[PDB]
Amino acid sequence: FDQLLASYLAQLSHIRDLFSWEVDVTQPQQNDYATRLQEKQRTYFTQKLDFPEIEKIIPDNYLDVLDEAPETYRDRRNRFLDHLLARFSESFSDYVLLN
Amino acid sequence: IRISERLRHKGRAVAIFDYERLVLEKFPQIYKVRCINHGQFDDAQEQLYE
Amino acid sequence: KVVNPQYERIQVDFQVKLKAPYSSNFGYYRRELQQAIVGFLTPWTVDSGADINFGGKVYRSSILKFVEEQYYVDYVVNFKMNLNNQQDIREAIAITPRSVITSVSPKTSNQDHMIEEFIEQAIVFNNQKLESGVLGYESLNDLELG
Amino acid sequence: NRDLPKNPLIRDGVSQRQRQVSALSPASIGVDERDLADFLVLVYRLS
Amino acid sequence: ILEVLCYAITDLGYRNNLDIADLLALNPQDGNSRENNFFTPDAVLTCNP
């Protein structure tokens, strides 16, 4: 139950990372575009718990099992980019040679 | 709808998209419109020059 | 300059088969279908009228889909489409950039949509056999052992 | 009668109902889209 | 356990009614914070003559 409450609040702390226009890069580089590293390439965010005697119950690192599958990331990121493009009255679906 | 279209044509008519959307927003009694590029209409003959 | 359009007219021609018990009152349901096609080709007259152009063209298959959805129709054969003295067309294109497509009416012109009844026993097939009299193409009763 | 040139661009106009876009309505993408089965899978994997 | 959970949920719902200008604020102490959501009127509503 603590994990669900903490995850709910982690989704509020990170609103500006759902609507950001930044480009995902894996190798830091200068390309005159705003870029994003691996720690922020998510559509669901999580926290680490803290209570007394945590070190005996929840050992070293457990958050890796909570990550979303890459297919969900791709789908939701694509839909958010579509929504952000639509505010300027333009979409990639109208250009055949682009796909 | 109105504001997303304005954020693209900036309120000026320079291209096919601009002529069409500026008319449909101002005059609600139109159903459909088409913009013809580099074409002229002759009233006396009722002829269109392509 | 802002002007008024130029109108082109479409006519259709097909044979139809009705469901029971509607098939016993054919003459009444030929009139219901004629008026339905006119309403389809004039989407400005009806609220929430859908569009028929796909790009700059109108296709024969989209009218055929609308006819097949009426609740009293079984199937259609020999569907044909006419556009201003062009006699059998698969896709209608604008003649001039001012052109707009509408329907044919007996009080704006003297033409209507031509609908007649399909009769099973009077059918003639137009399909020739590729081979005859040889092995692989005939029933066992018809091999004459030449 | 004179055989004048033609316009090579072929298209149609725009109607009042073709101004709607689906991606522009905020109902197309939500902030949390998970349901009951996802929460059951989550608890099973966390255990 | 039920009562404690309902109290926590009330806290969660409380934190969703803060003004949207406060939910989207940037961190003054993080030098890596940048504007990455919005464009200003000078950059959107303008056009060359």
Next chain:
Amino acid sequence: EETADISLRRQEEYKLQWYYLKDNAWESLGDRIVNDASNGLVTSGIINL
């Protein structure tokens, strides 16, 4: 309903026919009948012209 002939069923070539008058000229009504619940005057019913 009891007064008809039961020898054979009315054939299709002998349906009933309906006309209306227009200054000494008769015109057909065959394609303006919506519903005939009398089935051609064999049972009591309403015809809708």
Next chain:
Amino acid sequence: DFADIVILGEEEIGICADIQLETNADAEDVLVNIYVRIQQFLSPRLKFYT
């Protein structure tokens, strides 16, 4: 009485078509769906109930 017992054969229906697609489409899946729907149309099977 019963005169005889006959085993039925089968015919294959070949289909030739020219289809126009929408912009947001993939021909492969669409053709898969066409084959599935036509085959279901031609040869239905009955279900057994409790």
Next chain:
Amino acid sequence: HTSDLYQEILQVPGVSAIKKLSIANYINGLRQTQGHPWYLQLTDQYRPVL
């Protein structure tokens, strides 16, 4: 009847319009006829498949 296939091909998402459609009969892998745009007659002893 081809319209029974026309109306079901028109139900697949992504299909815009059908520009051409025709059917033909095959037995034993060999084409038996030339085909027809609107209807096809089946052999007495055989079941149609795709």
